[PDB]
Amino acid sequence: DWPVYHRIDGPIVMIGFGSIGRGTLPLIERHFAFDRSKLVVIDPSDEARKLAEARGVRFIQQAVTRDNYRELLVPLLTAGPGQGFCVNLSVDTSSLDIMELARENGALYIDTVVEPWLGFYFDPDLKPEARSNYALRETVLAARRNKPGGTTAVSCCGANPGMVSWFVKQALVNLAADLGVTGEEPTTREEWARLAMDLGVKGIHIAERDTQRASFPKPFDVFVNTASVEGFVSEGLQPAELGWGTFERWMPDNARGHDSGCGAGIYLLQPGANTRVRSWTPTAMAQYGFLVTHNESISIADFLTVRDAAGQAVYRPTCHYAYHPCNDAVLSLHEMFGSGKRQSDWRILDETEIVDGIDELGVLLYGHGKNAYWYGSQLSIEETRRIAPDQNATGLQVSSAVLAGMVWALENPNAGIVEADDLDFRRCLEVQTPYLGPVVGVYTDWTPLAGRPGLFPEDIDTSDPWQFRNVLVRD
Amino acid sequence: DWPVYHRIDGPIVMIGFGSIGRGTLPLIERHFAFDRSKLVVIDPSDEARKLAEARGVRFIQQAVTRDNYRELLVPLLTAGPGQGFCVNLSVDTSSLDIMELARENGALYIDTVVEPWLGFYFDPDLKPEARSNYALRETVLAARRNKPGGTTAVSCCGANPGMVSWFVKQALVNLAADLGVTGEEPTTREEWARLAMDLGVKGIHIAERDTQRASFPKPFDVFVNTASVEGFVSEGLQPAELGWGTFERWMPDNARGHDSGCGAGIYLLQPGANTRVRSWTPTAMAQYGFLVTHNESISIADFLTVRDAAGQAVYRPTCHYAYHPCNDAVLSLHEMFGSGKRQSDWRILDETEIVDGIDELGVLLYGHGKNAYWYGSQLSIEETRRIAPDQNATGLQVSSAVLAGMVWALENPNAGIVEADDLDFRRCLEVQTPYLGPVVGVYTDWTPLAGRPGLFPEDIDTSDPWQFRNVLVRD
Numbered sequence A, B: 001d002w003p004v005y006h007r008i009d010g011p012i013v014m015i016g017f018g019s020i021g022r023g024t025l026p027l028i029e030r031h032f033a034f035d036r037s038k039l040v041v042i043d044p045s046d047e048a049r050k051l052a053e054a055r056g057v058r059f060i061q062q063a064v065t066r067d068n069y070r071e072l073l074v075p076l077l078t079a080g081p082g083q084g085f086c087v088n089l090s091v092d093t094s095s096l097d098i099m100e101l102a103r104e105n106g107a108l109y110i111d112t113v114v115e116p117w118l119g120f121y122f123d124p125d126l127k128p129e130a131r132s133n134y135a136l137r138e139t140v141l142a143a144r145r146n147k148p149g150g151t152t153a154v155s156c157c158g159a160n161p162g163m164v165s166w167f168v169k170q171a172l173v174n175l176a177a178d179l180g181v182t183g184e185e186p187t188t189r190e191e192w193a194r195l196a197m198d199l200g201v202k203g204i205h206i207a208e209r210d211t212q213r214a215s216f217p218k219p220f221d222v223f224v225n226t227a228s229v230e231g232f233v234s235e236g237l238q239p240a241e242l243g244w245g246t247f248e249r250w251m252p253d254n255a256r257g258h259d260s261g262c263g264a265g266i267y268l269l270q271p272g273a274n275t276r277v278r279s280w281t282p283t284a285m286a287q288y289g290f291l292v293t294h295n296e297s298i299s300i301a302d303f304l305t306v307r308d309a310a311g312q313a314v315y316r317p318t319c320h321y322a323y324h325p326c327n328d329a330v331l332s333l334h335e336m337f338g339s340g341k342r343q344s345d346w347r348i349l350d351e352t353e354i355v356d357g358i359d360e361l362g363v364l365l366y367g368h369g370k371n372a373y374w375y376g377s378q379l380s381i382e383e384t385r386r387i388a389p390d391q392n393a394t395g396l397q398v399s400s401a402v403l404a405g406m407v408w409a410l411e412n413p414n415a416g417i418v419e420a421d422d423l424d425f426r427r428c429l430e431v432q433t434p435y436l437g438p439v440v441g442v443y444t445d446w447t448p449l450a451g452r453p454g455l456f457p458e459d460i461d462t463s464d465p466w467q468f469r470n471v472l473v474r475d
């Protein structure tokens, strides 16, 4: 049987019922005990309403907005009898404002992104620095400094950000064993950072290759993806963004830093989904990824920062996304950027439309004595259908991470505002691994200088293959 | 009944029986009178041999090389009783050497590319300039200067290079007529160049969008295309190249000119099939094209050059390819450049494998009073199957162009070495148009500055939207 981890006696408030909400609700019903009538789904769309009604779940057809979120959500979060859980899987809503509302009213909180209120992403009066995920994350860090401790709110606990933070810790443990580095397993952030430094990890790619393909050819003027099209396009049009490692000797002319905050990131004055980087995964081998901004690019680099007494950073890894989405999404990007505007329509691939493929999602640690190491999941669509309904492999890696975060929050309900890097990674992977298919570690001798230089002059750094100067693709 | 244009009174030697040879053979058999035993195909491929046997045509399974071409081709082309025709549709053979051999022996000649002997494209001892199509074309121009007149040899007479030269002439005439400019169309090179100057044509894109889709999804580690994969990859890895207009006021730091030759071209120190440009076609609307090197980028800009009394160029249009290949080819390029090497296998889509689509191929004249004008063919796979066997829409545009050039060569057999810009464009389009489906001219308001600047700073020239500065896709 499937484990029922805990009883939830309070209200379960799910904000948003898109691809991730539809895959997460069945997991919540499977793994927690509660009266089904205590669950409530809020979503503005008719499509979501019909799906919730088909499940006999209470539904409120409203867009949560800055104007209504307090009057709308407080009664739902405080309905009792016990502590409620707010499961935020929406677009167009402020993660920070909803999280602070939940904590104000004693309700647990989890989300998979630091989302702003509608309008932020395309606000023409915002400076590029202000549109960065670094800046949005800094609003969460400030909230934590302002109100330490208290009710647990889990920020950015999906597949990536989320799970990959746990993969980094496991990968560091495996690397220490394989490199003969002795010592006890870290138990504090400082100890984790020092292990990464001692192992010589120069940087980390969130190295992903989605090979799911549809039973129909990509339609003209339709954006196709395996998860949120609105969310992927939004993050893809934000600046390319990365955690910036101490080993880097070069940044492009259009790179910029931040005057304040944790200090772990840079951004480029170009859209991340039109920025290519050289990377590698077990199934793809050498591939292009897109340098799409992601919270974990900053959070992981920040988490693994070592500082001296004066507080200056002496070690920090480079960390960023290196995303090869499904073929139809690759075509959708070429179409969107080539036309200069979003397609007229979009669709997310349903499991019934996917004929084969996997979502290979892992972390690539590089620069150490064994060059590069990839650790992560190779979950296939066939396995997904076997073990979880209403979602594809992309969705299941996300929904199962939300499940793990919820289990952790119930067992640690007064931990304050926390990121995935703050959770107990072993417990979270213990809950999530049944839904991840093959989880494997693979070494490779590939480097970004493989085969280079070619028949054209290239601006490369031959002294250190893994420099960003060698990873970034110029156009 | 199909028209029979001419009797060929000698041997027909077709070098190469790939996608284009297979599409051109039925048109030769359809439109020319000759004894069946006069035609012979030469190709080293076993796949090619079996198809030729099924077609009942003489086949010699041999690679033409520097070492054997004289011993092989001279007897075959001079078998008599009269003038033969060398129809060169191969890869890895020297167009120049074979052309000069055919001419030395009184045989007509046609090809669709200035191909070099095997080894040239990837010779590591060659500078990028020496690997350019500008340089290859200059060998043909020098051969013409050294031996003017003589037997007709048609260089680069496919769809593009080839047919698009005739489209440029027709487009110019249409542009003038659409402005109410009546009277004598030009008859000399200098008059054509002045028509383009007088109408204010700043530049020309060879603006192509292939929408042919396969009945099977893109296989991993397989390069898929609708015509020669080897030929497309070769030119895709040559330097980006363009005819360079007098109106341009900016070029990239890695752009280079030529010390010698006609003077009409620049090249970039980067591969063309990984260089993107902003362009437009009627069915695609705004799209990315790849800036792949092509003979006609130089020959058209050269043809349309106006010089002053001293001999200095005072007007010349920009001209280059803006190629959006079929979706599987787009994915194949992303795969190839992302891995840094050619896929292990490749395949060309057969008409039986194509579910739908067109090859939209035309010329986009811009900078004139009506901004932009696209003229060309919208041939669909469905129409192709009705009018010509053994090829897709891509192949038929090419094979019908070779048919037209062969007709022109037979009708003008003492014209010496000629390019597509040298032929009677009306007669050539008269022969080819039955195979081009819809041939239309479409005006558009679109410019490369549409929607720009976006939310990031960009280096653009707002006073002149069609400047290469605005067309080239840069970081």
Ligand SMILES: NC(=O)c1ccc[n+]([C@@H]2O[C@H](COP(=O)([O-])OP(=O)(O)OC[C@H]3O[C@@H](n4cnc5c(N)ncnc54)[C@H](O)[C@@H]3O)[C@@H](O)[C@H]2O)c1
Pocket: A015, A016, A017, A018, A019, A020, A021, A042, A043, A044, A045, A048, A062, A063, A064, A065, A089, A090, A091, A092, A093, A112, A113, A115, A156, A157, A158, A159, A160, A161, A162, A227, A228, A229, A230, A231, A232, A348, A398
């Ligand atoms: N961390 C990760 O790994 C990860 C992965 C995928 C998605 N995500 C994020 O999770 C979120 C959900 O993804 P998805 O795929 O389900 O998206 P989706 O687009 O499928 O669904 C979004 C849903 O939000 C609803 N919505 C829109 N405006 C709203 C409002 N004002 N209030 C409430 N609901 C509103 C829509 O009606 C829609 O059903 C997105 O923000 C996405 O960026 C994270």
Ligand SMILES: NC(=O)c1ccc[n+]([C@@H]2O[C@H](COP(=O)([O-])OP(=O)(O)OC[C@H]3O[C@@H](n4cnc5c(N)ncnc54)[C@H](O)[C@@H]3O)[C@@H](O)[C@H]2O)c1
Pocket: B015, B016, B017, B018, B019, B020, B021, B042, B043, B044, B045, B048, B062, B063, B064, B065, B089, B090, B091, B092, B093, B112, B113, B115, B156, B157, B158, B159, B160, B161, B162, B227, B228, B229, B230, B231, B232, B348, B398
């Ligand atoms: N101008 C245009 O519009 C245009 C369009 C398409 C192709 N082309 C060119 O036409 C040519 C043919 O294209 P394709 O699609 O048929 O290519 P293809 O790859 O299908 O076929 C090429 C053929 O050449 C043969 N070959 C290889 N080496 C040879 C040798 N030494 N001697 C004789 N034959 C040899 C191969 O066996 C093969 O059958 C290529 O050079 C291509 O670049 C021009």
